[PDB]
Amino acid sequence: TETTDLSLMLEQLTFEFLPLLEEKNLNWQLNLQKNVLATVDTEKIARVFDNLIRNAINYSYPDSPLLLELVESDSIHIRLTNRGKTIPEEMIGRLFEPFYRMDGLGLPIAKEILLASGGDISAESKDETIIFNVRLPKP
Ligand SMILES: [Mg+2]
């Protein structure tokens, strides 16, 4: 039953990804609150975030920011926003359905992981913006 410092994790992950932002001239815009702890396996959640960031890099328009926000309120909230082609509402509703991408990677599995961790994930898209919202329980 590990405790993960999500603030440290995302500070490190965003730094490590810097070389991968160069090809499309992306930049981080970070709003990461500090000392945000969650009861979740560290490597498991880091692998979920790695996949969400890689999807955001691949989705993104060039010359654009990737906005990553970490807030502690009644739950812990992580939001990753990129600019890109708007995802239509029909598609948004199916992003977490297994094998829909065969009808971004890893989205059904992200939801399975987060639900079993006592949290969840959702997606929104409007006005050339694509947003993934992750919730985790506060200890
Ligand atoms: Mg391992």
Residue numbers in the entry: 210 to 312, 323 to 358
Give passages from the manuscript.
VanS is a sensor histidine kinase that responds to the presence of vancomycin by autophosphorylating and subsequently transferring the phosphoryl group to the response regulator, VanR. The phosphotransfer activates VanR as a transcription factor, which initiates the expression of resistance genes. The VanS sensor kinase is organized into several structural domains, which include a periplasmic sensor domain flanked by two transmembrane helices, a membrane-proximal HAMP domain, a dimerization-and-histidine-phosphorylation (DHp) domain, and a catalytic ATP-binding (CA) domain. Here, we present X-ray crystal structures for the catalytic and ATP-binding (CA) domains of two VanS proteins, derived from vancomycin-resistant enterococci types A and C. Both proteins adopt the canonical Bergerat fold that has been observed for CA domains of other prokaryotic histidine kinases.
The crystal asymmetric unit contains two copies of the CA domain, related by an approximate twofold axis of symmetry. Metal ions also figure in the crystal packing of the VanSC protein, with 3 Mg2+ ions being situated in two different lattice interfaces. In particular, helix α3 occupies very different positions in the two structures, being positioned much closer to the nucleotide-binding site in VanSA than in VanSC. Hence, it seems likely that the ATP lids of VanSA and VanSC can adopt a range of positions, and crystallization of these two proteins has selected for two different conformers. The mutant’s affinity for TNP–ATP was decreased relative to wildtype; unfortunately, the ATP competition assay could not be performed, as protein precipitated in the presence of high concentrations of ATP.
